[PDB]
């Protein structure tokens, strides 16, 4: 039917020849580069837009980091695999462009996908073949199928493309068929990708295998319960251990369709999870509601991996809202950091920072214990480019009724602000006084122990055009573009309408990752 006994290998393309083609593209971007907001320590390609984090792994000692990437422009277009490799996860390399359409299922776009370490040792990818259902523009809809392709080397500086491996039954789904991953649970190699149903309702389904090469329709694991959700993008699944050391089971997916309901759902599309169990053979049952993984203005299409401990995710900045000035400087959209999963007593995932990313840092600069005994400001530093600034806030001390920091704060009076809100509850990223871009604000929550508790640890990372607020030692954490004017880049701690207590405030400047 439509899962082949080997691999459907149908070459239309020199893959040599339409990988040249892509190198040129990003490198001619790349020399015409505005680094007024490149990141200095954020992933991001050296020419042209990229979107969702692709190939995720660590082989042969080796942190790798794939990415959808259109070589030709600063907007999404025919999609190609971008490629940057580290040994710390701190100083990264650039590598060659990984994938370029040269497949008959993939002409039209080599889309999102996925490494495993076999029962070999050896690395696979399982990617999405994109082809227009008519072959022309979106207006047909989408014609996806599941590839399969093999490194070459442990480099992996190259691959190797076997063809299709799960075709797509055309007339049983709503053309969405995309985004796989693949992990081993007992004795079964499992598949699951994102799936639009012949009711337009966004699906999970979940193939088996004994070989990782020929796969077996299982059944639908999971189904958004929400019509409004039309597809689950770039889905994912994992073990994880609770407080008790019980297994649960963590499903994550970049929703579709829902509509905004107050602070939640805000973004064009939302990435998010529940946690909950799995039994081999049944479906998905979630213990929890949905919770977003990043409260920010742009965050989509996360994926994570296993480094052997860890489980690691890594975020795209989406933007999804116009206008996008970025979209001027020869290149569009950086990876989050990456962040370590885990779960603790509070029953709730929390992503800190990987511990790499200390090393990030060139020095430390204590501020110390600051009082803003009335409402005001006072500036940190005169101008910040790149820096990572922790903080304590004593809540039980503090009057103000907005209290944080102003970051990008340039002599035209625009500013970012990161700051505690004390008439909703929450950390807020609010961007009304930028300079450019769409503006707006994004608010993540905080449980009625955090609000209690008397004090709030922020960890802000700032960089050329973005933030990074990790709320609590990354209970919540929110990520957004942050479009700084010319000049320099004050960072400023501000007390509104009441007091501010500081228990603790320290600054690193951070280093170059090496991509710029």
Same mark, same amino acid.
């Given at each position: 039917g439509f899962t082949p006994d080997a691999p459907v290998l149908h070459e239309i393309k020199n893959h040599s020849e339409e990988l040249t083609k892509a190198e040129a593209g990003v490198a001619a971007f790349a020399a015409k580069r505005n680094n007024r907001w490149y990141p200095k320590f954020h992933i991001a390609s050296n020419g042209g837009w990229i979107n969702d984090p692709n190939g995720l792994c660590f082989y042969k000692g080796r942190w790798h980091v794939f990415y959808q990437l259109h070589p030709y422009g600063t907007q999404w277009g025919p999609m190609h695999w971008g490629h940057v490799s580290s040994a710390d996860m701190v100083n990264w390399k650039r590598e060659p462009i990984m994938f370029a359409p040269s497949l008959?299922?993939? /002409?039209?776009?080599?889309?999102?996908?996925?490494?495993?370490?076999? =029962?070999?040792? &050896?690395?696979?990818?399982?990617? @999405?073949?994109?082809?227009?259902?008519? $072959?022309?523009?979106?207006?047909?809809?989408?014609? #996806? +199928?599941?590839?399969?392709?093999?490194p070459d080397n442990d480099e992996l500086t190259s691959a190797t493309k076997r063809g299709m491996v799960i075709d797509c039954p055309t007339d049983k789904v709503n053309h969405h068929y995309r985004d796989p991953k693949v992990w081993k649970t007992g004795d079964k190699w499992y598949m699951t990708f994102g799936v639009?149903?012949?009711?337009?309702?966004?699906?999970?389904?979940?193939?088996?295998?004994?070989?990782?090469? &020929?796969?077996?329709?299982?059944?639908?694991?999971?189904?958004?319960?929400?019509?409004?959700?039309?597809?689950?993008?770039?889905?994912?699944?994992?073990?994880?251990? =609770?407080?008790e050391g019980n297994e649960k089971w963590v499903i994550g997916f970049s929703a579709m369709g829902a509509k905004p309901s107050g602070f939640m759902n805000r973004n064009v599309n939302n990435? $998010?999870?529940?946690?909950?169990?799995? %039994?081999?053979?049944?479906?998905? &049952?979630?213990?929890?509601?949905?919770?977003?993984?990043?409260?920010?203005?742009?965050?989509?299409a996360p994926q994570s991996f296993n480094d052997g401990k860890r489980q690691i995710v890594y975020g795209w900045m989406s933007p999804?809202?116009?206008?996008?000035?970025?979209?001027?400087?020869?290149?569009?959209?950086?990876? @989050?950091?990456?962040?370590?999963? %885990?779960?603790?007593?509070?029953?709730?995932?929390? @992503?800190?920072?990987?511990?790499?990313?200390?090393?990030?840092?060139? =020095? %430390?600069?204590?501020?110390?214990?600051?009082?803003?005994? +009335?409402?005001?400001?006072? @500036?940190?530093?005169?101008?910040a480019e790149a820096v990572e600034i922790e903080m304590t806030i004593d809540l039980a001390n503090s009057t103000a009724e907005r209290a944080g920091l102003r970051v990008h704060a340039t002599e035209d009076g625009a500013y970012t602000s990161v700051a505690y809100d004390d008439q909703?509850?929450?950390?807020?990223?609010?961007?009304?006084?930028?300079?450019? $871009?769409?503006?707006?604000?994004? %608010?993540?929550?905080?449980?009625?122990?955090?609000?209690?508790?008397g004090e709030l640890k922020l960890r802000?990372?700032?960089?050329?055009?973005?933030?990074?607020?990790?709320?609590?030692?990354?209970? #919540?954490?929110?990520?957004?573009?942050?479009?700084?004017?010319?000049?320099?880049?004050?960072?400023?701690?501000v007390a509104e309408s009441g007091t501010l207590k500081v /228990?603790?405030?320290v600054l690193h400047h951070m280093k170059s990752i090496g991509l710029e």
């Open positions: 008959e299922e993939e /002409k039209d776009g080599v889309f999102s996908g996925s490494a495993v370490i076999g =029962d070999d040792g &050896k690395l696979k990818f399982y990617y @999405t073949g994109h082809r227009w259902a008519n $072959g022309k523009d979106n207006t047909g809809g989408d014609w #996806q +199928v599941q590839m399969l392709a093999e639009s149903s012949a009711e337009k309702r966004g699906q999970m389904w979940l193939f088996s295998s004994d070989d990782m090469v &020929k796969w077996t329709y299982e059944q639908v694991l999971f189904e958004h319960p929400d019509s409004n959700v039309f597809m689950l993008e770039c889905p994912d699944f994992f073990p994880i251990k =609770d407080v990435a $998010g999870y529940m946690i909950g169990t799995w %039994t081999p053979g049944e479906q998905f &049952k979630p213990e929890t509601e949905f919770r977003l993984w990043d409260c920010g203005h742009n965050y989509y999804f809202v116009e206008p996008i000035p970025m979209q001027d400087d020869g290149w569009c959209g950086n990876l @989050t950091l990456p962040r370590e999963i %885990t779960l603790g007593a509070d029953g709730d995932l929390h @992503t800190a920072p990987v511990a790499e990313m200390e090393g990030l840092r060139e =020095d %430390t600069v204590d501020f110390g214990a600051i009082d803003l005994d +009335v409402s005001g400001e006072k @500036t940190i530093v005169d101008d909703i509850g929450r950390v807020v990223v609010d961007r009304q006084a930028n300079a450019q $871009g769409d503006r707006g604000y994004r %608010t993540a929550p905080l449980s009625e122990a955090e609000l209690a508790a802000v990372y700032v960089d050329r055009g973005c933030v990074e607020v990790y709320v609590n030692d990354g209970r #919540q954490v929110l990520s957004s573009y942050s479009y700084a004017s010319e000049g320099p880049r004050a960072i400023k701690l /228990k603790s405030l």
